[PDB]
Structures are given as C-alpha cells and as structure tokens.
C-alpha cells in the first residue's frame, strides 16, 4: 500500500513557568516511532516502536542534537511571533509544525509536506512544488520573505526527496511485519431499542490497522449521511483502531438498513445487517 512519514512538533510558551516546552513525535503511517520532550528528566530521542530500536548510537545522537537545537530555535520563533502579532510577553502561545513525505504503492515519492501553525491557525506552508510558499497573513509573509532570501525551500526539497524517502523505505523494511500488515476490521451490528417504535442500529468496526476506514449506513440502498451518528476513529491502545456508525430506525424496518465497510485490509467492501 501507500505509506507516509511525518514529524509533529509542538512548542508551547508558559510565561512565569520556565522556558517554552518543545515536544517532537515521529510517525510512520499510524505508528509512532520516536518522541522527544524538552521537559524530560534527560531530554533525548526515545524509541516508541520495536523496529527503531536497532538503530545505532549515531542515529540517536543525530536526532537528539536536532531536537535539542530545535528546542532553542522554537523558543526564538515564539519570541519572533510575539513581535509579528504585536503581542505581549504575558500570554501562552503555541507553534506547531508537521512535515514529511508520502510514498505511493510502488515506493515512489507522491508528495512532500511542510506546514506550520501559530495558536492553532495555519501560518505558512511549503507548496506541493517544494519550491514556493503560501503565507496565511501579513506576519507569515515576513517569514516567507526571509525564507525566500535564504533559499530554505531548496534545502527542504532536498530532505523531502532524499533522506525522508530513504529513511521511510528503511523503516518500512525493518518494520515490515507490522508497518506492511493491514489488520481488517472485525465487524458486527448491535440493536438497542429506544422506544416502542424505534431502535438504534450500531455498526461496529474493531481491531483494524491502519486507521483509515469508511463506515456507512444505507436505507433501501441510499446513503443515510445526514441521519448517521459517526464517532471519530479512536485508538484501542494495542496499535489498532475502533469506530462505529449508528442510525435510529423504525421498529420493523431494520432489514431495510445495511452497513457498508471499506478498509484496505478487506479484499472487497463488506455489507452487514442486523442479524437477530
């Protein structure tokens, strides 16, 4: 299948409570594999998946140096952002960054990503060409001009097309028994009377990996999007995910409803119904 690598950085100021905290996590698909937290007793890159543990000391040292430097860089970026928004030193603010690469099914680069946010709003993003930027506001245009002058995009392009893809391919091989294994959902429909004339049908998907899934209800073969309660896909804690979709139906009409499940671990989409 297709695969991705992403790093997620969060830098959070906390005036009066020390210097801003910097956290970085790395994922391949829906599997976290590293963390770094500047608030740790001994900040260092730490493994979070078994297949990364075999990397040697040079890997851990290189990544730890990066994240230690980034702790300082993002403290400066938080100070800069106050100037760009005319804000005081009294408030708490957050910078976020997410970057990485996507591969198609043949392992080829599909596209790269590098986006940043300030206080949860888009700030600046590298365009798909890996050569130009989109700034969200006149503050981010200041950063855009600085990054244009310094040819930042060219360096990011070189990482995204080079080391990012090379290391993702390495992780996929080293972790192939899990990263390259789809676990299909285990599915069933439950029935919960709500009154003498209506009942809830809830279509469950459990134990699946990766997290992407589609669950839909049809009535008489017509999608029931407006009438379906669909919960956010949620982690089970064993790597897998869970989701459900529910509809309230007239008692006596249950067999008119079908639940449809699409997941990459399924060779064909599934159709389910309440089976009393």
């Amino acid at each position: 299948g297709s695969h991705s690598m992403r790093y997620f950085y969060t830098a959070m100021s906390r005036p009066g409570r020390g210097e801003p905290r910097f956290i970085a996590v790395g994922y391949v698909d829906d599997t976290q594999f590293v963390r770094f937290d500047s608030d740790a007793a001994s900040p260092r890159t730490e493994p979070r998946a078994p297949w990364i543990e075999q990397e040697g000391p040079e890997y851990w040292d290189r990544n730890t140096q990066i994240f230690k430097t980034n702790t300082q860089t993002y403290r400066e970026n938080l100070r800069i952002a106050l100037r760009y928004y005319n804000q005081s030193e009294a408030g708490s603010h957050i910078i976020q960054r997410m970057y990485g690469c996507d591969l198609g099914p043949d392992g080829r680069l599909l596209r790269g990503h590098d986006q940043s946010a300030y206080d949860g709003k888009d700030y600046i993003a590298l365009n798909e060409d890996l050569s130009s930027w989109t700034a969200a506001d006149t503050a981010a245009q200041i950063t855009q001009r600085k990054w244009e002058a310094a040819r930042v995009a060219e360096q990011l392009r070189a990482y995204l097309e080079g080391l990012c893809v090379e290391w993702l391919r390495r992780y996929l091989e080293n972790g192939k028994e899990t990263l390259q294994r789809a676990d299909p959902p285990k599915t069933h429909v439950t029935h919960h009377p709500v009154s003498d004339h209506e009942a809830t049908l809830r279509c469950w998907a459990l134990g699946f990996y990766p997290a992407e899934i589609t669950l839909t209800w049809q009535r008489d073969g017509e999608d029931q999007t407006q009438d379906t309660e669909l919960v956010e896909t949620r982690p089970a804690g064993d790597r897998t995910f869970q989701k459900w979709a529910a509809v309230v139906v007239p008692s006596g009409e249950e067999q008119r409803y079908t639940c449809h499940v699409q997941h990459e671990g399924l060779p064909k989409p599934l159709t389910l119904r309440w089976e009393p």
Binding site: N70, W147, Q155, L156, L163, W167
Partner: peptide
C-alpha cells in the same frame, strides 16, 4: 529521521 531547522521565523 528528522531534518534540521534552516532559519528562524
């Protein structure tokens, strides 16, 4: 593998 920061904001 992470990338290095190139420039501040």
């Amino acid at each position: 593998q992470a990338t290095q920061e190139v420039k501040n904001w």
